[PDB]
Paper text:
In line with many other HEV-Bs, E3 utilizes CD55 for viral attachment and FcRn for viral uncoating, gaining efficient entry into the host cells. Following rounds of purifications and analyses, three types of particles were identified, one containing significant amounts of viral RNA characterized as mature virus (or full particle, F-particle) and the other two being empty inside with substantially different sizes defined as expanded and compact empty particles (EE- and EC-particles).
The external surfaces of the F- and EC-particles with a diameter of ~ 325 Å are indistinguishable, apart from some disorder on the inside of the EC-particle, including N-termini of VP1 and VP0. Superimposition of the asymmetric units (protomers) verifies the similarity in capsid structures of the F- and EC-particles and reveals substantially conformational differences between F- and EE-particles in several exposed loops, such as VP1 BC, DE, EF and HI loops, VP3 EF and GH loops. Remarkably, most of these loops are key determinants for immunogenicity in HEVs, indicating that EC-particle, rather than EE-particle, has more potential as candidates for the development of a vaccine. In summary, the atomic structures of E3 mature virion and the two types of empty particles reveal serotype-specific structural features between the subgroups within HEV-Bs and underline the potential of E3 F- or EC-particles as ideal vaccine candidates.
Residue numbers in the entry:
A (entry chain A), F (entry chain A): 55 to 289
B (entry chain B), G (entry chain B): 2 to 10, 24 to 47, 79 to 330
C (entry chain C), H (entry chain C): 1 to 238
D (entry chain B): 79 to 199
E (entry chain B): 266 to 330
């Protein structure tokens, strides 16, 4: 009976950084939406983290956000020949702030916003954010409408008001064209989990509600009293 | 400062917090080791369950008031103790052989009964614990089973993908929506298949939520004393469902030729310690 | 200043780490604490709650609800085996989508004693005895009751009590058996046989339905952590 | 739902009843043969887990005109488990028995039964 | 059901089990079983013995059969 | 007699990092098995470490794994002209986990798996792993079959269930093609060694069993009483 | 914390552990300084060795039980002390002039003798120490030598490369496999050359494993009390060989014309404190 | 913060180091400790166990088993040398695949006293005396018994006792001699000569076989560590 559980705790089950978003943004003139890359902060994009959160109804944690920003070189002509290091800027936007329309905008100063400048060839950039919500818990399921007359959106997409992370390059790149990809990682710590609930049997299809297709319970075996194999797979 | 502790194998570790924020420290990851029947009289309407039957007290906790220690309201008008505590009886659903299942949505299922739909129609906020008691009259030659479960925040998926759901199809006014043993083909209705329980989870895995069994052999009724579970302490009852009952028969009822075939099922909920806040002269509808 | 030396392990991003980091919202007070009921502490408390296991998991039955109801027909059989399954809590079709299995599937190694409680959903007047036997890996699955009797077993009187429970014991060469059990670190077969034959009176229906609930006993443990091979995705779903 | 006693002997349990009496032999509980009344020369080991399980024999079928059935137990467990794999080697032998005979009842199935362990029949 | 905890009864303290029967079960129905037309007719009877404190002596490399 | 042994201990004989594997993986599209490089964790690949382990029957140690990941440039055309630093990702897979079929797969998130991202031009990446087995000792010799009916594999290849290390690039490399080589090093510490046994006289031929060809005992000298040379090799 | 120690040449070193894991510290690398003959009566079968002869007690330790301090089983049925402890005698191998050598595999060499092959045929686990005693009747004009050795985990290589071995060729049922002084040409048999001892090691280097010499000048017999050596505390005896005897004559036997030429060799093993676990009604074959 | 300076030795991978490193399996409990017998502490305890040395290592004999058996024919010789070898424990063909040599070959420097125990495998009635002499490096190998007598020697009576042991003494200019001994830091020759001649009676075979066991005395030490020049590979063997 001296086999107690340490790696089954609520911390070690949830203190592992999972990838949440995959962005892509170039560094050239023309098509200004390709220069920056916006993302409203969900946890519902990637599945590998979503199933771990949707075992509990409510949560409350502090987080550790990290970014592995890597870049390539775009094909074609007029390439760099030689290229200094290129730095990236990650800006958080709170709910209700002014967003930049494009790159080199007026609003990229970020006096109040917690921007962070990161150089390539270094360690991945890291920050900590506390339990930030108006409510007392990050509710993973909200069985209720938005308006009191029962219209509007339905589901968890009413208390997910966490603003956006808008990333951009801060070099002009006079000669060449080069994309970069952003990979956001969430590692929640000091986690508390309330009201457990079953895992999702059906596959995920949306990031707005709990839509699903009716799937089978388990896989099929041969008979009611099938014991599998009596000897190995040979002969 | 200068702390020393133990690690999971003398051996120690000295970690200091170098930052002025509580959410900037590392993760903790360390532990410091003719017959007698009971009769619930609530309000002015009693029940009679059994002497031998267990009563499931929610998620461990009894339903209680919201004290001044954890209130965020401005002014707190009165809560009634007799006017809204009665054992209100809803409509009687009828159990047949091939009956799939039934569900309810209780903050929007008591809007017509008594003053519970006459207090929450005026006040903005709301908070109440519930004392569900579901019963079916048994006999010794009427084999069959039942499962009740009060799932909290039972977000239900729509029948057709890239659609929302409609309030007419999610809840009903006095009736319990059936649980098609097959798949609904609707364009705006709910995906009401019975082997996925609406939410998409496995229907065998509904036993985490407070649950009780109404096995016709050894039980006549079932009583779940559910507590108020919500993140925010107070939220309006017309745009939020606190939980959801689900009565799913796992074993179908099989009578004989000379036996009764109209076995009913009733639900007799009763709100415990119902509090209200924010009186606005509204009269919602 | 201080002449440090950068060891190997510098400028890396090991995922399962525990490092400090500066705060992005400095001096940000939080909402005060509330007592929501059901504050779970360890994940294994979900694997102590019973979840029905789909024992009749046949191909036609799995899609239907009738995969959880195991048939116990009344008559003179005395040879029929109501059910049999290898007790592999991780790979076996019977236990994998059950709550015990889903938490277990997250963790690579499993050590403990599983408990199967078989409820009888049947007429009050019905009476019968069933022998449920955990046969350890030994040699070959039990095929007749005399073979099952030798292995650890419980005789359950359906009439005297519904819900007889078998705590399958932990007998194993190694402290931990991998969830993806191989021939080595595998587990023994579990089977149920008629002892007297169900005796149902004229007024009640002869057929009855028995269901199986599976939850780990108190002494259960997990050892590693890994991706669940049950859920997947293709693109960034929007 | 109700309380039933469960004799756990070896690694196979039973469930009898709460209200049922259990007849303890000729008054005495089955015990070992101590050194006070042994006439052997050397005494090798006796197992406590390997041969104590509740072995289940074949299921006899009760009909209307069924006369009766008997057994002979030192030569009725020769194939089951290791009890027929210890006595097949050793010369002597001594064991007490814990017979439990069951038939699944119903309220509309009247009839009676008598079991009896006659010694030296 | 019925449970009899029989003790080892023999004159000699130890005797071989292949040429001696210690006792004999006898299941004799004194009253016959009478069901009705719509009732089950395959009522079984099982016996579930278990040897308690089984002792052995005189190991001989025999392997009887 | 004051010549006691310190460098003859079980630590200093076995606390030296030996190379265990040599991988090679490109960074181009097409032939997706050339993008990543898998390795089931043996110690039986390289001989220089294998003979040191096969002096003792059982072992129990904690390890220090290190990787010197170096890369070249592949010949041909469409070369980089200029190239930022390229980072590598080393992922451990436990026994019984989902493996990636190719690069840019869904399973490269590694929420539970202990991945490690390493940048070129830095110190070699390092991690510690404890005594991880189901048994009580890493048995170097298992004289026994797998199945109880004496079939299946025979030898040490039944208790070596340690999963795999799957390495990949995490840059797209839009222009060029470039391979990289992985060199895994094992340095066991806190070593305990049970039941010593003779060194292997014959050369190694396999990494599955103890197959061998019958070799001579020693080399041959001239006679029974040959003392070698009586004077130097001159004259 | 803040430790000070010595190094191998005042001079010291202060190293701290900065991590919360026991396997993350550095390596330790520091030390803190008519005639009388004995008769073994085990079970109910004795032997007579010599008064002057040494008995090699395994790897130093006497064979003992597996206590509750280091058990990982669930339930532990009985172990016999008389039924399986007898000095079982195997078949008598015959020593000639050009005899190469013989081996055995003892967990699968006692499967027919007594109850030791009637307990392990039923129970799943198994554990037993052994008390091998090999004897050959001597005379003063029968020069020659012998080496016995109980090598543990003697993995034997196949005759043909990129093949496995077969259970019929690795062990035998009642016979000892010969050790060809040359090389076997088989496609599935064992590589049974005598100057590599099967495992590929030098046959002169078999003296680490508990060994004894049966030199015909100064010794008549040899007794090795081998202990149970395995990583796991309990493993099945039908898919695992605990160790391996190897009787290799280093010096051939040279008699004269008027002398006996049928010198035999017997082995008389006896399992000490044999424990069993996991009774399954199997009866393996 | 702290203004350190990166010394030379930064971002390197010296193999024979001792540095800390973060854990990849955090909070991972282990299997508890078991007492397997034969827990060796130092490697030199393998070099204290005797291993037969192939003294008759002739070209035809090495392939055969008859390389460990040294001939001691019975007759009037009084000049024949049974064996002679330079006492180089590392390079010499006689001692290199023996256990003492194999551990020694791993370590570059050797210091201690070797012990050779020569057992006699022969008829009980045989009786003879042999002089085994360690001649130090001095000048030339002993070629006749009178030359051998001067150097340290032991007279062994085969009849009185089998297994006479010679502990070859450590007489050397330097504390440590390299395993790859050169003319400098070399070791003296060891030889064995007949003293009386084996006397075997009519009933026993005249020829007899003597074998040599070599193990280091307690005071043996190693000083460096290096690749063994005995085992090799070509590719990654699969
Ligand atoms: C460093 C610059 C970026 C800073 C980003 C701000 C912090 C990130 C937002 C925290 C996310 C909270 C956790 C999940 C919130 C919601 O409850 C879930 N999405 C539920 O759908
Ligand atoms: C940092 C990512 C990679 C992590 C790799 C996991 C740890 C490496 C496995 C440890 C190897 C254990 C030592 C040898 C095990 C077996 O007993 C031998 N192969 C015997 O053949």
């Amino acid at each position: 009976n001296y086999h107690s559980r340490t790696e089954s705790s609520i911390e070690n089950f949830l203190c592992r950084a999972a990838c949440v978003y995959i962005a892509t943004y170039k560094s050239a003139g023309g098509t200004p939406t390709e220069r920056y890359a916006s993302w409203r902060i969900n946890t519902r994009q990637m599945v590998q983290l979503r199933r771990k959160f949707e075992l509990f109804t409510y949560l409350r944690f502090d987080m550790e956000i990290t970014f592995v920003i890597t870049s390539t070189q775009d094909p074609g002509t007029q390439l760099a020949q030689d290229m200094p290091v290129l730095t990236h800027q990650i800006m958080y936007i709170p709910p209700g702030g002014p967003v930049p329309n494009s790159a080199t905008d007026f609003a990229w100063q970020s006096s109040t916003n917690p921007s962070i400048f990161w150089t390539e060839g270094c360690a991945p950039a890291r920050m900590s954010v506390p339990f930030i919500s108006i409510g007392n818990a990050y509710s993973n399921f909200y069985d209720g409408w938005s308006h009191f007359t029962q219209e509007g959106v339905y589901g968890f997409n009413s208390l997910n008001n966490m603003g956006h992370i808008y990333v951009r390059h801060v070099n002009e790149q006079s000669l060449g064209v080069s994309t970069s990809t952003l990979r956001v990682y969430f590692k929640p710590k000091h986690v508390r989990a309330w009201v457990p609930r079953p895992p999702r049997l059906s596959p995920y299809v949306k990031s707005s509600n709990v839509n699903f297709k009716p799937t089978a319970v388990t896989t099929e075996r041969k008979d009611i009293n099938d014991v599998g194999t009596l000897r190995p797979v040979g002969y | 400062g200068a702390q020393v502790s133990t690690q999971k194998t003398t051996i120690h570790y000295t970690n200091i917090n170098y930052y002025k924020d509580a959410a900037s420290n590392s993760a903790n990851r360390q532990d410091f080791t003719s017959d007698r029947v009971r009769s619930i009289t609530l309000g002015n309407s009693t029940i009679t369950t059994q002497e031998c039957a267990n009563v499931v007290v929610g998620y461990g906790v009894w339903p209680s008031y919201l004290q001044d220690n954890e209130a965020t309201a401005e002014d707190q008008p009165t809560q009634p103790d007799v006017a809204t505590c009665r054992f209100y009886t809803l409509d009687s659903i009828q159990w047949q052989k091939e009956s799939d299942g039934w569900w309810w949505k209780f903050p929007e299922a008591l809007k017509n009964m008594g003053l519970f739909g006459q207090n929450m129609e005026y006040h903005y906020l709301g908070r109440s614990g519930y004392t569900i008691h579901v019963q079916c009259n048994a006999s010794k030659f009427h084999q069959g089973c039942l499962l009740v479960v009060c799932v909290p925040e039972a977000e239900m998926g729509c029948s057709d993908v890239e659609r929302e759901v409609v309030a007419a199809s999610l809840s009903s006014e006095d009736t319990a929506k059936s649980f098609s043993r097959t798949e609904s083909n609707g364009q705006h209705t709910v995906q009401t298949v019975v082997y996925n329980a609406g939410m998409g989870v496995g229907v065998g895995n509904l036993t985490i939520f407070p649950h009780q069994w109404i096995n016709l052999r050894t039980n006549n009724s079932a009583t779940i004393v559910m507590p108020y579970i919500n993140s925010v302490p107070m939220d309006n009852m017309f745009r939020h469902y606190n939980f959801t009952l689900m009565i799913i028969p796992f074993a179908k009822l099989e009578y004989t030729e000379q036996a009764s075939n109209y076995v009913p099922i009733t639900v007799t909920v009763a709100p415990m310690c119902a509090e209200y806040n924010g009186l606005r002269l509204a009269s919602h509808q | 200043g201080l002449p440090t030396m950068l060891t190997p392990g510098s400028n890396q991003f090991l995922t399962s780490d525990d490092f400090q980091s500066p705060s992005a919202m400095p001096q940000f007070d939080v909402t005060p604490e509330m007592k929501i009921p059901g504050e779970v502490h360890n994940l294994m408390e979900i694997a102590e709650v019973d979840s029905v296991v789909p024992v009749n998991n046949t191909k036609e039955n799995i899609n239907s609800m009738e995969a959880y109801r195991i048939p116990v027909t009344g008559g003179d059989q005395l040879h029929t085996q109501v059910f049999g399954f290898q007790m592999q809590p991780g790979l076996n079709s019977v236990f994998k989508r059950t709550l015990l299995g889903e938490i277990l599937n997250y963790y690579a190694h499993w050590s403990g004693s599983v408990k199967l409680t078989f409820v009888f959903c049947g007429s009050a007047m019905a009476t019968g005895k069933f022998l449920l036997a955990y046969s350890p890996p030994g040699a070959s699955p039990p095929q007749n009751r005399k073979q099952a009797m030798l292995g650890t077993h419980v005789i359950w009187d359906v009439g005297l009590q519904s819900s007889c429970v078998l705590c399958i014991p932990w007998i194993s060469q190694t402290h931990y058996r991998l969830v993806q059990q191989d021939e080595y670190t595998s587990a023994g077969y579990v089977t149920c046989w008629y002892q007297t034959g169900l005796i149902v009176p004229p007024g009640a229906p002869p057929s009855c339905t028995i269901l199986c609930f599976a939850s780990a006993c108190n002494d259960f443990s997990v050892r590693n952590l890994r991706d669940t091979p049950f859920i997947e995705q293709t693109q960034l779903l929007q």
